[PDB]
Amino acid sequence: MEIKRVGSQASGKGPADWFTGTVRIDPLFQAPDPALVAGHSTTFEPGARTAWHTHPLGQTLIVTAGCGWAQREGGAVEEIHPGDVVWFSPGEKHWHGAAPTTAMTHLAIHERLDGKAVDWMEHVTDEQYRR
Amino acid sequence: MEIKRVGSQASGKGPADWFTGTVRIDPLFQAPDPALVAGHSTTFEPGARTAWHTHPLGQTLIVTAGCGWAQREGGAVEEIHPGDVVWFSPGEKHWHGAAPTTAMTHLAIHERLDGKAVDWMEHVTDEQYRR
Ligand SMILES: [Mn+2]
Ligand SMILES: [Mn+2]
């Protein structure tokens, strides 16, 4: 049994390669072998969002605060709210982040496949960032 | 990309064989093969807790409301509070629940191994719950 107490993990920032705007990453866990799951919290300032990317075994999002936007390639831009659970499929190309006037926070959970849980791709343009 | 909206997954009740007291289960997700990860929210009313049990691939908790207790076998009873992250090893026998006078809600994340994410065992006695 191991307990990581609230406040004991330092907050970080989202690398400018992988996010447009100001984004905070709050780590939570990464199960050790032979389990593969990891997770963390991510807070997006208004207008901020991930770049396009995919996950090798998909990813689950549990929105925990605010109001955000998300979109897979070919899909419409959807608004997401606290309590909504979002599932992206393996290899599914997508982004997510805040809405233009409100931040958003969600818990993200994904399994690692031989070490890897993400593949980053191009930024979401201001033309894409609209609804 | 699939969104399950807040309010779309009905609450259910913890079965008597797996819980002492009143427990509510709010489903969150189960990822389709080849992803093995699953998760749900559980709300324990004061005094309610799981029976003792184990998880084949361990379990991670993220407490989201109230104030609860948890224990692994041979271990002390520990308080867990919102924002705390708890990790139980694969195979580790344990239980968790509300404190005697406060409810607690957490998010539980576990990998399945052959479509099984838990082995249920004997109830936690009043004597084990306090002392
Ligand atoms: Mn993602
Ligand atoms: Mn458990």
CATH architecture assignment name of chain A: Sandwich
Secondary structure: helix percent of chain A: under 10%
**CATH top level class name of chain A:** Mainly Beta
Main β-sheet description of chain A? 6 strands, antiparallel
List the chains of the largest interface with their residue counts: A-B, 41 and 41 residues
Q: Could you give the count of β-strands of chain A?
A: 14
Quaternary structure state of the chains depicted: homodimer
Q: In what range is the share of β-strand residues of chain A?
A: over 45%
What do you see in this structure?
The structure is a homodimer of 131-residue chains. In chain A, 0% of the residues lie in helices and 47% in strands. Chain A has strands spanning 2-4, 12-13, 19-20, 23-30, 37-44, 49-50, 53-54, 59-66, 68-72, 78-80, 85-88, 94-98, 104-111, 119-120. Chain A has a 6-stranded antiparallel beta sheet, with no helix packed on it. The radius of gyration of chain A is 14 Å and the shape is globular. Chains A and B meet through strand 1, strand 9, strand 11 and strand 13 of A and strand 1, strand 9, strand 11 and strand 13 of B. Strand 11 of chain A pairs antiparallel with strand 1 of chain B, so a sheet runs across the interface. It is classed as lyase. The entry lists the keywords lyase, manganese-dependant.
Annotate the secondary structure layout.
Two copies of one chain form a homodimer.
Chain A: E1 2-4, E2 12-13, E3 19-20, E4 23-30, E5 37-44, E6 49-50, E7 53-54, E8 59-66, E9 68-72, E10 78-80, E11 85-88, E12 94-98, E13 104-111, E14 119-120
The structure holds manganese (II) ion (2 copies).
Protein name (chains A, B): (R)-mandelonitrile lyase
Cofactor (chains A, B): Mn(2+)
Family (chains A, B): Belongs to the cupin domain-containing hydroxynitrile lyase family.
